[PDB]
Design a protein around this ligand. Structure first.
Ligand SMILES: NC(=O)c1ccc[n+]([C@@H]2O[C@H](COP(=O)([O-])OP(=O)(O)OC[C@H]3O[C@@H](n4cnc5c(N)ncnc54)[C@H](O)[C@@H]3O)[C@@H](O)[C@H]2O)c1
Ligand SMILES: NC(=O)c1ccc[n+]([C@@H]2O[C@H](COP(=O)([O-])OP(=O)(O)OC[C@H]3O[C@@H](n4cnc5c(N)ncnc54)[C@H](O)[C@@H]3O)[C@@H](O)[C@H]2O)c1
Ligand SMILES: NC(=O)c1ccc[n+]([C@@H]2O[C@H](COP(=O)([O-])OP(=O)(O)OC[C@H]3O[C@@H](n4cnc5c(N)ncnc54)[C@H](O)[C@@H]3O)[C@@H](O)[C@H]2O)c1
Ligand SMILES: NC(=O)c1ccc[n+]([C@@H]2O[C@H](COP(=O)([O-])OP(=O)(O)OC[C@H]3O[C@@H](n4cnc5c(N)ncnc54)[C@H](O)[C@@H]3O)[C@@H](O)[C@H]2O)c1
Lengths: 330, 330, 330, 330
């Protein structure tokens, strides 16, 4: 099995942890964070979105004992002191959101780890990979990024559409679920004034680099897509609204056929397909990073269409982080 | 003053009433609904969205007495039995949502009213008029429709963009505020399954004819626009997300210049313009039916752009209903 | 196995169904509602609160096929026409909320059923039974009621406190989750004006008979308890706030000791006990009808205390409906 | 007029500012905060709860110009450097929530101010005052506190009830609106684990010292009251739920009479009275710190009753802060 260490036991670190429990190829052996082992156990045990942890969690001697397995807990603010080698860590899931560059993440390799997977878009030229889009381009680099949740949703769909009909250009809008960075009531958000306004009372316009980032995982689409976001008061599921101009004329039925074929073929487990009258909550706990909603989309004509795809911002992304870890471990 | 009668004291009927109080040329003299005066007074007095009524409302002899003025309250299920003439009603604001056809609405004329304005889109060929779009095309018709709130937002913006740069094709998405048609919890909705899902926990994909309806008030745009909606857990303000392909190249700055010019000139009071970091709640109580958000929009290139415009589904629309009434009575 | 038939496939009927799937002794063989099989299948398959159905649901010949088992679907507005005998129904879970009287409910007996359990409080003198409170008093009655969700939470707790310290008088408040009876936006509610106000933006004071209803299942407490409710913008979990005056002095520690003893003994499975820092969502899916929150309560002195107990309005109640069914069929 | 300087332009500082615009006796001449004048102008201009500021706000030379009046803006992290004397400040409204003791608040007097009013409960023995309860006990001290919003709601009601029937003992529960200290999604809250859970999805039990604090403003009630709180997903209005044991027997009608008399007499403007079917939103913008809801309350008997009172956590409190400032200025 692959031994993983999680740096940063936040929303993502915890979902990566919970998802890993259902996997036999990956095993989390250590967790690092500036929180008390007792507090971490509580946040693992109870979750307003994902429900109670299905298993046993006890704190003994400052460490966590999850389902019997002892998990080393530390509180190092500096990655270089993590001593991952003492616990035999192969890959480190970097989830603090603070070390998104090579020289910072590299510290884990200095601390004993062999490879690092950033659970967010790298801030430098560190390569990003998205399952269904470019895992095959992986060339053995020791530090890698899993891009973002929106890019993970957009990339697979954009690939199927482009491969079959050719995307001339497209604009995306993601109706985004409330994040941890937003506020409960009108408060300060210096770099993002709109973002500081009460999340529960508002539809908040926001900018996103997720659409442009698709160009990095799918070079052939570089410069052909961009978009924005609207932050809404929902808890977990977001939706991508992609308006595209096709090179090859295609009826909506042909578009549905192409997506469905991919969902049951080369992108099974990545891209999902549905024709049901679904709503956001129906995807809470969804592992597919992109679920094509056939009935929600609409076409003006054979070359201008609006496609809709759902994604659980935490569950889908987190499972793919594990997929990348497995992939880079050969 | 134009003496108006309101049929259907629901959400729209009530806001039309509150709005009319601030107009010296329009005067509400009668209301008809299947609710007792006491309950109607209560619903006028208190509103979770618009706040308390700015004035006095009392019940005497089963009739409302608002700000000292007596208002005849009736409970006729049949418009034909309304006797509008008895109280001198000139125009009837038809807001029950039940008589959106000439046949049904004409009963008000039989009952003594001179003209009728439907506060919703016509089901038959009754002409629809949208301020800033086609009020100039009015030709003496005694029964007219004010279209829907979404159409009132899209039409003015679409006209400005088309007149200046020419819209080849467009696809819209309205992130819609929760409607009274929605369920608080997963309940039966045979007409629209998704619509019966809990409104509070979901982002609900929905269909809309507002985009296509633009082709009716702006024939030159017939067949060039269509779209859908996403209903979200917010109270009053919605936003249109318009993705358009332009005939004539235009930089985003030039597009902004054009919109601002219209807002300050020809479409003053209908189309608004802002460059502030606004969010939905900033438009609660907004009179303009469409407020261009300069900083929220984004352009892929000089011919493919995404525009954003806000609108209070109740305040804007209701003020325009009053405008149409004044317009057809000139 | 006890063969059960469900009349009314609404919220309660559906959860009773999901819950029954996990019971080897109870078996649902028929459902009756005025909805088509297709729609019912959809409502069973997807739920915004409870998630997707854990199993397979298919429609064949207008009948449901859940987990391979065929379930007879009918659409009778009249219980008398149900023919329960044809499918061998032993007990009928009456969940339409329309037949809460012996006269009306007895029609199921005429239709071939042996016994009937109302999933709501009786309107007449049909006896009500609450697990942990008076199941032992059952005396062969063929038509019984399971009371309401709030009563199921209050009764067990009230009994433990009374049996040990003696309740002289008590006043309760249930901070209630939003019900399907509520409006998403300010709409008509002649029966309860406050109840027609927008559920999403308000804290709505409401009346409840659950506290007084305790006097019926626990006669010794008749006339000693009453209370009210506050409906809030949350989905499933409610909480009772019970302020009581004790006959025998008791420290909060002694009260905790007593409650814990009952939860681990006589009331195991009905009354739960916790000392964790829980919040409402931690009880979504909770089977216990009352979960004592040890750290939330507070005592003024040894004779005046405020107790707090949580309850999932749907999961707890529905599991007990099944318990009553099994109990009256023993 | 009294010249006031505000230290801390947060939620409270801003509402105190906006309320002061409607007062001719008080004039804000300076504001201090670690935010940019441009950012402060934006937060003053737009508010999701209170709507847009009714007036003009422009930033010139690093200062704010509100309705023409120039307001000195500074960004001193240390009160002693505020130089209040240069702007002629009489009283300082201390709203940062950081200087709740004599020695810290005293710095303003060192900086040139004459008196200080803490907009929160003092952490030391600094005297607290609540309008309607003990303003008359004010003995000319230079540093004073306005207690908290819940105490401001509870104190006046408790006084009327105690004065007329005598409170033997009582327990309170405040259904509290979402505060700035809560989180949007499950995050860290080291001193309050429950408080770190998602506010939008939960009913969160919480402890409060507001009930006990009543003993400080009303010594005669010292030790007779205590309580707790439930944090719910509403934006602005909270409600006090007081269960009391009366010394003198009183029917609910006699209780309503006593409260109404006080509301129209000695506590006019402080204590409000209503018999309408109101809900939380009906009190958004309420200046009365306590509004007795006659129809929501319930009595078990003539000596044990449950009273309900509403309060806008920001508007009511803020207006009383201004009242205290006026009061201490003779
Ligand atoms: N939340 C999502 O939906 C989502 C989706 C895709 C990518 N991401 C990315 O995941 C990253 C983390 O996001 P999150 O929501 O989990 O954040 P979070 O704030 O919930 O968690 C961050 C965690 O890191 C810990 N930490 C902080 N400083 C540390 C330090 N100096 N050393 C060690 N540990 C430390 C914190 O204690 C906290 O527990 C970000 O890059 C974010 O962009 C998030
Ligand atoms: N609410 C919005 O945001 C919005 C926006 C654009 C257009 N509209 C339109 O407004 C119209 C009404 O919608 P609403 O949201 O105000 O609904 P509503 O149900 O609140 O109002 C309908 C009112 O008519 C009354 N009524 C019913 N039958 C009647 C009868 N037979 N005679 C007299 N009165 C009767 C009802 O009691 C109710 O008060 C619809 O055509 C709708 O499409 C609404
Ligand atoms: N939901 C809760 O939290 C809760 C808690 C305790 C008790 N209850 C009780 O459950 C009962 C039902 O409430 P609900 O919330 O499930 O409501 P609901 O409206 O969702 O369910 C009623 C169902 O009965 C169906 N129906 C209507 N008429 C019918 C008929 N004539 N014949 C057959 N089927 C018919 C409806 O289609 C609907 O599906 C009530 O007595 C209620 O008090 C509910
Ligand atoms: N919010 C309520 O409903 C309410 C009710 C009653 C009492 N209070 C009390 O009011 C106080 C402030 O609460 P709030 O909600 O306004 O807080 P907030 O966080 O919204 O505002 C605090 C403000 O003080 C400013 N500030 C911070 N540090 C400063 C410093 N070092 N020097 C100068 N200025 C500084 C911050 O920039 C911020 O603008 C607290 O004691 C709170 O308990 C609040």
């Amino acid at each position: 099995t692959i031994k993983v260490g999680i740096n940063g036991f936040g929303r993502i670190g915890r979902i990566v942890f919970r998802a890993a429990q259902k996997r036999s190829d990956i095993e989390i052996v250590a967790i690092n964070d500036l929180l008390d082992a007792d507090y971490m156990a509580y946040m693992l045990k109870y979750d307003s979105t994902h429900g109670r942890f299905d298993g046993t969690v006890e704190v003994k001697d400052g460490h966590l004992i999850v389902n019997g397995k002892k998990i080393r807990v530390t509180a190092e603010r500096d990655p270089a002191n993590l001593k991952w080698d003492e616990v035999g860590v192969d890959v480190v899931a970097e989830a603090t959101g603070l070390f998104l560059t090579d020289e910072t993440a590299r510290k884990h390799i200095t601390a004993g780890a062999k490879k690092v997977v950033m659970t967010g878009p790298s801030k430098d030229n560190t390569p990003m990979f998205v399952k269904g889009a470019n895992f095959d381009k992986y060339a053995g680099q020791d530090i890698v990024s899993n891009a973002s949740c929106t890019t993970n949703c957009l990339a697979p769909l954009a690939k199927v559409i482009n491969d079959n009909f050719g995307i001339i250009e497209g604009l995306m809008t993601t109706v985004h679920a409330t994040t941890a960075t937003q506020k409960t009531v009108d408060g300060p958000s210096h770099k993002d004034w709109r973002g500081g306004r009460g999340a529960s009372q508002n539809i908040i316009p926001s900018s996103t680099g997720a659409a442009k980032a698709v160009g990095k995982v799918l070079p052939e689409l570089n410069g052909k897509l961009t978009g924005m976001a609207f932050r809404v008061p929902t808890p977990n599921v977001s939706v991508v609204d992609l308006t595209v101009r096709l090179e090859k004329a295609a009826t909506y039925e042909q578009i549905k056929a192409a997506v469905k074929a991919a969902a049951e073929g080369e992108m099974k487990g990545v891209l999902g397909y549905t024709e049901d009258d679904v709503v956001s909550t129906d995807f809470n706990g969804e592992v597919c990073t992109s679920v094509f909603d056939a009935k929600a989309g609409i076409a003006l004509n054979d070359n201008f269409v609006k496609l809709v795809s759902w994604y659980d911002t935490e569950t889908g992304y987190s499972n793919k982080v594990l997929d990348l870890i497995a992939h880079i471990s050969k």
